[PDB]
Design an enzyme around this catalytic site. Structure first.
Site, PDB file in Angstrom:
ATOM      1  N   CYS A  50       0.834  -1.208   0.000  1.00 56.52           N
ATOM      2  CA  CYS A  50       0.000   0.000   0.000  1.00 56.52           C
ATOM      3  C   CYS A  50       0.866   1.253   0.000  1.00 56.52           C
ATOM      4  O   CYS A  50       1.569   1.526   0.973  1.00 56.52           O
ATOM      5  CB  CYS A  50      -0.958   0.052   1.203  1.00 56.52           C
ATOM      6  SG  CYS A  50      -2.076   1.498   1.177  1.00 56.52           S
ATOM      7  N   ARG A  72      -0.244   4.648   2.890  1.00 58.15           N
ATOM      8  CA  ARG A  72      -0.251   4.461   4.343  1.00 58.15           C
ATOM      9  C   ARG A  72       0.096   5.713   5.140  1.00 58.15           C
ATOM     10  O   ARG A  72       0.022   5.671   6.373  1.00 58.15           O
ATOM     11  CB  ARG A  72       0.712   3.333   4.743  1.00 58.15           C
ATOM     12  CG  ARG A  72       0.222   1.974   4.337  1.00 58.15           C
ATOM     13  CD  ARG A  72       1.257   0.900   4.689  1.00 58.15           C
ATOM     14  NE  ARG A  72       2.260   0.751   3.645  1.00 58.15           N
ATOM     15  CZ  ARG A  72       3.378   0.050   3.778  1.00 58.15           C
ATOM     16  NH1 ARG A  72       3.667  -0.518   4.947  1.00 58.15           N
ATOM     17  NH2 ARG A  72       4.214  -0.052   2.755  1.00 58.15           N
ATOM     18  N   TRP A  90      -9.384   5.917  -1.452  1.00 61.07           N
ATOM     19  CA  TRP A  90      -9.614   6.597  -2.709  1.00 61.07           C
ATOM     20  C   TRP A  90      -8.534   6.163  -3.704  1.00 61.07           C
ATOM     21  O   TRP A  90      -7.533   5.517  -3.352  1.00 61.07           O
ATOM     22  CB  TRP A  90      -9.667   8.114  -2.531  1.00 61.07           C
ATOM     23  CG  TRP A  90      -8.472   8.726  -1.844  1.00 61.07           C
ATOM     24  CD1 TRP A  90      -7.257   8.996  -2.406  1.00 61.07           C
ATOM     25  CD2 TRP A  90      -8.395   9.168  -0.484  1.00 61.07           C
ATOM     26  NE1 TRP A  90      -6.415   9.556  -1.474  1.00 61.07           N
ATOM     27  CE2 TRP A  90      -7.093   9.680  -0.285  1.00 61.07           C
ATOM     28  CE3 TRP A  90      -9.293   9.161   0.593  1.00 61.07           C
ATOM     29  CZ2 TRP A  90      -6.667  10.180   0.942  1.00 61.07           C
ATOM     30  CZ3 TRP A  90      -8.876   9.669   1.817  1.00 61.07           C
ATOM     31  CH2 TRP A  90      -7.581  10.183   1.985  1.00 61.07           C
ATOM     32  N   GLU A 114      -3.921   3.706 -11.118  1.00 57.54           N
ATOM     33  CA  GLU A 114      -4.674   2.455 -11.056  1.00 57.54           C
ATOM     34  C   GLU A 114      -5.736   2.411 -12.139  1.00 57.54           C
ATOM     35  O   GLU A 114      -5.974   1.364 -12.745  1.00 57.54           O
ATOM     36  CB  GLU A 114      -5.332   2.259  -9.687  1.00 57.54           C
ATOM     37  CG  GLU A 114      -4.435   2.380  -8.493  1.00 57.54           C
ATOM     38  CD  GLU A 114      -5.211   2.207  -7.182  1.00 57.54           C
ATOM     39  OE1 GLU A 114      -5.740   1.091  -6.937  1.00 57.54           O
ATOM     40  OE2 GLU A 114      -5.312   3.192  -6.408  1.00 57.54           O
TER      41      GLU A 114
HETATM   42  C1  HEM Z   1      -6.544   6.458   1.562  1.00 55.83           C
HETATM   43  C2  HEM Z   1      -6.028   6.348   0.336  1.00 55.83           C
HETATM   44  C3  HEM Z   1      -5.363   5.060  -0.193  1.00 55.83           C
HETATM   45  C4  HEM Z   1      -4.642   4.991  -1.313  1.00 55.83           C
HETATM   46  C5  HEM Z   1      -4.318   6.178  -2.249  1.00 55.83           C
HETATM   47  C6  HEM Z   1      -4.195   3.625  -1.503  1.00 55.83           C
HETATM   48  C7  HEM Z   1      -3.415   3.169  -2.536  1.00 55.83           C
HETATM   49  C8  HEM Z   1      -3.126   1.855  -2.801  1.00 55.83           C
HETATM   50  C9  HEM Z   1      -2.620   1.329  -4.050  1.00 55.83           C
HETATM   51  C10 HEM Z   1      -2.335   2.165  -5.311  1.00 55.83           C
HETATM   52  C11 HEM Z   1      -2.422   0.014  -3.894  1.00 55.83           C
HETATM   53  C12 HEM Z   1      -1.927  -0.970  -4.986  1.00 55.83           C
HETATM   54  C13 HEM Z   1      -3.195  -1.722  -5.442  1.00 55.83           C
HETATM   55  C14 HEM Z   1      -3.079  -2.386  -6.798  1.00 55.83           C
HETATM   56  O1  HEM Z   1      -2.118  -2.077  -7.551  1.00 55.83           O
HETATM   57  O2  HEM Z   1      -3.972  -3.211  -7.156  1.00 55.83           O
HETATM   58  C15 HEM Z   1      -2.821  -0.342  -2.535  1.00 55.83           C
HETATM   59  C16 HEM Z   1      -2.782  -1.598  -1.967  1.00 55.83           C
HETATM   60  C17 HEM Z   1      -3.297  -1.977  -0.742  1.00 55.83           C
HETATM   61  N1  HEM Z   1      -3.968  -1.148   0.133  1.00 55.83           N
HETATM   62 FE1  HEM Z   1      -3.969   0.930  -0.001  1.00 55.83          FE
HETATM   63  N2  HEM Z   1      -4.670   2.867  -0.452  1.00 55.83           N
HETATM   64  C18 HEM Z   1      -5.399   3.711   0.368  1.00 55.83           C
HETATM   65  C19 HEM Z   1      -6.074   3.298   1.493  1.00 55.83           C
HETATM   66  C20 HEM Z   1      -6.094   2.032   2.010  1.00 55.83           C
HETATM   67  C21 HEM Z   1      -6.915   1.610   3.124  1.00 55.83           C
HETATM   68  C22 HEM Z   1      -7.951   2.535   3.836  1.00 55.83           C
HETATM   69  C23 HEM Z   1      -6.633   0.316   3.348  1.00 55.83           C
HETATM   70  C24 HEM Z   1      -7.182  -0.626   4.430  1.00 55.83           C
HETATM   71  C25 HEM Z   1      -7.674  -0.160   5.596  1.00 55.83           C
HETATM   72  C26 HEM Z   1      -5.605  -0.110   2.391  1.00 55.83           C
HETATM   73  C27 HEM Z   1      -5.036  -1.355   2.319  1.00 55.83           C
HETATM   74  C28 HEM Z   1      -4.344  -1.860   1.235  1.00 55.83           C
HETATM   75  C29 HEM Z   1      -3.872  -3.214   1.059  1.00 55.83           C
HETATM   76  C30 HEM Z   1      -4.064  -4.355   2.081  1.00 55.83           C
HETATM   77  C31 HEM Z   1      -3.236  -3.281  -0.124  1.00 55.83           C
HETATM   78  C32 HEM Z   1      -2.571  -4.550  -0.708  1.00 55.83           C
HETATM   79  C33 HEM Z   1      -3.498  -5.177  -1.754  1.00 55.83           C
HETATM   80  C34 HEM Z   1      -2.849  -6.403  -2.376  1.00 55.83           C
HETATM   81  O3  HEM Z   1      -1.894  -6.968  -1.770  1.00 55.83           O
HETATM   82  O4  HEM Z   1      -3.301  -6.811  -3.473  1.00 55.83           O
HETATM   83  N3  HEM Z   1      -5.304   0.965   1.610  1.00 55.83           N
HETATM   84  N4  HEM Z   1      -3.242   0.812  -1.925  1.00 55.83           N
HETATM   85  N1  LIG Z   2      -6.827   2.642  -4.031  1.00 55.52           N
HETATM   86  C1  LIG Z   2      -7.115   1.432  -3.787  1.00 55.52           C
HETATM   87  N2  LIG Z   2      -6.695   0.483  -4.613  1.00 55.52           N
HETATM   88  C2  LIG Z   2      -6.556  -0.845  -4.325  1.00 55.52           C
HETATM   89  C3  LIG Z   2      -6.070  -1.298  -3.097  1.00 55.52           C
HETATM   90  C4  LIG Z   2      -5.922  -2.654  -2.836  1.00 55.52           C
HETATM   91  C5  LIG Z   2      -6.239  -3.575  -3.831  1.00 55.52           C
HETATM   92  C6  LIG Z   2      -6.714  -3.142  -5.065  1.00 55.52           C
HETATM   93  C7  LIG Z   2      -7.053  -4.159  -6.124  1.00 55.52           C
HETATM   94  N3  LIG Z   2      -5.872  -5.022  -6.358  1.00 55.52           N
HETATM   95  C8  LIG Z   2      -6.074  -5.661  -7.678  1.00 55.52           C
HETATM   96  C9  LIG Z   2      -4.971  -6.632  -8.106  1.00 55.52           C
HETATM   97  C10 LIG Z   2      -5.443  -7.321  -9.375  1.00 55.52           C
HETATM   98  C11 LIG Z   2      -5.147  -6.785 -10.627  1.00 55.52           C
HETATM   99  C12 LIG Z   2      -5.595  -7.415 -11.785  1.00 55.52           C
HETATM  100  C13 LIG Z   2      -6.326  -8.601 -11.707  1.00 55.52           C
HETATM  101  C14 LIG Z   2      -6.811  -9.297 -12.939  1.00 55.52           C
HETATM  102  C15 LIG Z   2      -6.649  -8.710 -14.191  1.00 55.52           C
HETATM  103  C16 LIG Z   2      -7.114  -9.360 -15.332  1.00 55.52           C
HETATM  104  C17 LIG Z   2      -7.739 -10.598 -15.217  1.00 55.52           C
HETATM  105  C18 LIG Z   2      -7.909 -11.192 -13.969  1.00 55.52           C
HETATM  106  C19 LIG Z   2      -7.442 -10.539 -12.833  1.00 55.52           C
HETATM  107  C20 LIG Z   2      -6.625  -9.126 -10.449  1.00 55.52           C
HETATM  108  C21 LIG Z   2      -6.187  -8.493  -9.292  1.00 55.52           C
HETATM  109  C22 LIG Z   2      -6.526  -9.105  -7.953  1.00 55.52           C
HETATM  110  N4  LIG Z   2      -5.813 -10.389  -7.851  1.00 55.52           N
HETATM  111  C23 LIG Z   2      -6.870  -1.779  -5.314  1.00 55.52           C
HETATM  112  C24 LIG Z   2      -7.921   1.065  -2.594  1.00 55.52           C
HETATM  113  C25 LIG Z   2      -8.900   0.102  -2.336  1.00 55.52           C
HETATM  114  C26 LIG Z   2      -9.340   0.141  -1.011  1.00 55.52           C
HETATM  115  C27 LIG Z   2      -8.726   1.099  -0.199  1.00 55.52           C
HETATM  116  S1  LIG Z   2      -7.575   1.963  -1.175  1.00 55.52           S
HETATM  117 CL   LIG Z   3      -9.266  -0.993  -9.217  1.00 54.61          CL
END
Ligand code: HEM
Ligand SMILES: N=C(Nc1cccc(CNCCc2ccc(-c3ccccc3)cc2CN)c1)c1cccs1
Ligand SMILES: [Cl-]
Ligand code: HEM
Ligand SMILES: N=C(Nc1cccc(CNCCc2ccc(-c3ccccc3)cc2CN)c1)c1cccs1
Ligand SMILES: C[C@H](O)[C@H](O)[C@H]1CNc2nc(N)[nH]c(=O)c2N1
Ligand SMILES: C[C@H](O)[C@H](O)[C@H]1CNc2nc(N)[nH]c(=O)c2N1
Ligand SMILES: [Ca+2]
Ligand SMILES: [Ca+2]
Ligand SMILES: [Cl-]
Ligand SMILES: [Gd]
Ligand SMILES: [Gd]
Ligand SMILES: [Zn+2]
EC number: 1.14.13.39
Lengths: 403, 400
Positions: A107, A110, A279, A284
């Site tokens: 993330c 954070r 947000w 993304e």
């Molecule tokens: C407040 C603004 C926030 C922003 C801008 C942000 C941004 C991001 C981004 C860009 C990612 C990469 C996701 C991806 O590429 O699919 C990520 C991952 C993640 N975020 Fe944040 N986030 C925010 C808030 C939060 C909150 C509120 C939580 C939980 C309470 C959180 C928990 C996580 C977790 C657990 C991941 C890892 C997801 C994974 O391993 O696939 N984030 N975040």
């Molecule tokens: N700002 C945010 N963002 C964010 C944060 C955590 C996780 C994610 C979503 N993580 C997606 C990873 C991913 C990417 C592509 C595919 C996929 C693409 C094509 C075909 C099948 C799957 C599947 C996954 C999940 N494994 C977004 C926030 C969400 C909530 C608070 S902040």
């Molecule tokens: Cl998304």
């Protein structure tokens, strides 16, 4: 302790926090698997996890070793001895959810980790009541475009009863209709959940941005289909500040990213349903969701409309089209007054977070490959920052799809 | 055997070659350090392992010539304490060390490498001659060719051959009473060393440094590169006519001269190699890094961009046009250059070739993904396994 260098500044820290990592990652001295997406396949070990977490809680409030701290440890020990499990105090649940966010290595957002609204849904008893909690989460978090971070925590896993689960990967997702040609209309990321919704009685659309219904699972029940009220799902039409034809592509995205398929782990207890939202960072949407070849894959269409030479790589037509798509997303969200952050400001705030955490805890688990944005990598400060990746608890964790 | 997935295609392979990883990397089950830049009977055992590699690669495993070579190296190290490689063993060893380099995106080319044997070298003046012929050969009027020159191996009791310069061609960097740097900040250290050891400096941003060559146990000696040996490319933009007036330039030949080559337990501390540039190395890292020339904001001002908010993506727009200028200028000057899209596409083909050849390929994702347009290239979506094979190119301490 691993020595960590920032190559932009020349500064050097030591990540002493990594030495406290509990669970093990996928790397060994023979081979590093840091680039893999999925790096992974009671009473005594429950207690050691519970005691560690209670110790974290009482440290956070500057009351370690107090009478209240010793009594809470004894109280958890007694409940585990009598029932095999225990319950978190309300205050511990709030702390544990923030800690899990703080501990999430992938993330970049954070800096915000202490500003998290925690909805306690542990008394939820049905799929219908889950849906009410979810709608209240979406309303609170969306806040008519002024987005607010929130997490709703449904009841913990316990012996003798099924899990609560939200089958959808996010609360708001676009349908992906698998065409017969092997192509997709809509979001190819959501083909599975789309087919499951239809199989569970949803009447599908035929558009590219059709909001999916929710499939909600109460304990020992098949999933139940619920449609989100349209007034709750805020969406942003995409337009470009100077390319007027861009609006004619008919692109849209939704305001609220709300991940609903991860497991929250606090003090050895497991919460399989605990959706969280914040947000968007604009890359993304603009880079991954719209330009990945296996997602909406619009890069070539935009470049052709821009009159770029798409017959040679060396014109950098891909890079130019992607920049303008990212400009559209940022412009469109700002125009609609929906919270969004660009990857330059997000990574600058993450650098501040690393500095805070170095002081607070002596390190910060960080996954370089996920922290560095998918465009303009070395133009952001995080590219030049060495990072140490490890697993702390409380944590958000991947878990198998319930089907 | 680690399961490796491509997320764009969904294809799965298994890396069975990582099981043969000889040396130990920095990561543990407790913590991954993948993002860090710098992570007797001993010599005999590595020497044996390399000989078996060699004879396997020519389908001569275990046979008559294989036994004879094993016994020679044994008697050599008994007499002297080291041993000499055959010329073909040395060629095979240089190529493998390139093939094994996890951070090199250009390895599709690994079989095509000109090896210059300089093991008969003594004195820095002869070093300078080997280097000048290397430069002339590799530059080839801009039609660049990959090459390596191998100087004498380290041995006990004797000093070392070293090239103090990190690259054969480097621009100087000068400091002032405002702490800043005119030229390349990366080369402030070597520039003050060249100044100490004789060289009188310039005051330009692109002054080509002299060479500080070190023969065993002597002080380094200061040699000037003949200017017609150093091919340079003035940078212009195909449509932004003011870009040329910025006065930017870069040199044709990327020739790394400070890494250690390791073959069969032997160590060559001076073994400079060269290929050609990938455009992002010049246009993004060397020109736009904040601790390098750091020209990004200058270009954005010239492009009339809005630099007071990050959300205008002025940094991104300026970076693309600098990379366009680099590509256009090398192509117009007829100097070999590869853009990051073509280069990553070819590394994907390399990964497929190596899967069949050796069952895997060590690759360092952080270094293979380009520093701009990461996820627009196919390598971003490719999981990779990083591990250390020998022969290898290795980092080594500076001589000073
Ligand atoms: C407040 C603004 C926030 C922003 C801008 C942000 C941004 C991001 C981004 C860009 C990612 C990469 C996701 C991806 O590429 O699919 C990520 C991952 C993640 N975020 Fe944040 N986030 C925010 C808030 C939060 C909150 C509120 C939580 C939980 C309470 C959180 C928990 C996580 C977790 C657990 C991941 C890892 C997801 C994974 O391993 O696939 N984030 N975040
Ligand atoms: N700002 C945010 N963002 C964010 C944060 C955590 C996780 C994610 C979503 N993580 C997606 C990873 C991913 C990417 C592509 C595919 C996929 C693409 C094509 C075909 C099948 C799957 C599947 C996954 C999940 N494994 C977004 C926030 C969400 C909530 C608070 S902040
Ligand atoms: Cl998304
Ligand atoms: C022929 C075209 C070649 C291209 C396009 C190419 C490209 C690259 C690039 C972009 C890097 C990343 C380096 C950095 O970011 O500073 C790299 C690293 C590397 N290359 Fe190649 N290269 C080529 C040829 C060669 C040759 C001929 C050799 C040796 C015989 C070689 C050995 C290496 C090694 C050892 C590294 C790692 C260096 C380090 O860790 O700093 N490459 N290459
Ligand atoms: N195409 C090429 N490229 C390439 C390949 C391998 C290695 C390198 C050089 N790797 C650079 C490492 C580096 C760069 C800058 C600085 C530095 C920057 C600012 C201040 C101080 C130092 C430090 C280091 C290593 N510490 C380039 C080729 C060269 C030879 C054949 S192909
Ligand atoms: C193969 C590679 O790990 C995969 O494409 C990763 C790389 N970095 C990422 N970084 C972020 N933030 N999100 C992602 O989905 C990915 N995907
Ligand atoms: C901190 C990080 O390891 C460092 O900045 C690395 C990242 N990836 C890189 N990749 C390449 N090709 N070259 C580099 O210098 C770096 N630097
Ligand atoms: Ca109780
Ligand atoms: Ca002064
Ligand atoms: Cl360079
Ligand atoms: Gd326009
Ligand atoms: Gd002007
Ligand atoms: Zn690792």
């Amino acid at each position: 302790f691993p020595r960590v260098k920032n190559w932009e500044v020349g500064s050097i820290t030591y990540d002493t926090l990594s030495a406290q990592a509990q669970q093990d990652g996928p790397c060994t001295p023979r081979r590093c698997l840091g680039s893999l997406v999925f790096p992974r396949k009671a009473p005594e070990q429950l207690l050691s996890q519970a005691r560690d977490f209670i110790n974290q809680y009482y440290s956070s409030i500057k009351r370690s070793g107090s009478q209240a701290h010793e009594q809470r440890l004894q109280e958890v020990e007694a409940e585990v001895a009598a029932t095999g499990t225990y319950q978190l105090r309300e205050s511990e649940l709030v702390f544990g959810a923030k800690q899990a966010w703080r501990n999430a290595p992938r993330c970049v957002g954070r800096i915000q980790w202490g500003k998290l609204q925690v909805f306690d849904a542990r008394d939820c008893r049905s799929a219908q009541e889950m849906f009410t909690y979810i709608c209240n989460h979406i309303k609170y978090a969306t806040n008519r475009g002024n987005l607010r971070s929130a997490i709703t925590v449904f009841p913990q896993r316990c012996p003798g009863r099924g899990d609560f689960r939200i089958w959808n990967s996010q609360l708001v997702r676009y349908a992906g209709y698998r065409q017969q040609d092997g192509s997709v209309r809509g979001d190819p990321a959501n083909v599975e959940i789309t087919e499951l919704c239809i199989q569970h009685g949803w009447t599908p659309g035929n558009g590219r941005f059709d909001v999916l219904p929710l499939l909600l699972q109460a304990p020992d029940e098949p999933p139940e289909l619920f449609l989100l009220p349209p007034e709750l799902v805020l969406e942003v039409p995409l337009e470009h500040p100077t390319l007027e034809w861009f609006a004619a592509l008919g692109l849209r995205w939704y305001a609220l990213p709300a991940v609903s398929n991860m497991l929250l782990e606090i003090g050895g207890l497991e919460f399989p349903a605990a959706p969280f939202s914040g947000w968007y960072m604009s890359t993304e949407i603009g880079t991954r969701n719209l330009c990945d070849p296996h997602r909406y894959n619009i890069l070539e269409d935009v470049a052709v409309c821009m009159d770029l030479d798409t017959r040679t790589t060396s014109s950098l037509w891909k890079d130019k089209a992607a920049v303008e798509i990212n400009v559209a997303v940022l412009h469109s969200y700002q125009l609609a007054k929906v919270t969004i952050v660009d990857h330059h400001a997000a990574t600058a705030s993450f650098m501040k977070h690393l500095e805070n955490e170095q002081k607070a805890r002596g390190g910060c688990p960080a996954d370089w490959a996920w922290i560095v944005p998918p465009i303009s990598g070395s133009l952001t400060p995080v590219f030049h920052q060495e990072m140490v990746n490890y697993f702390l608890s409380p944590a958000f964790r991947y878990q198998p799809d319930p089907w």
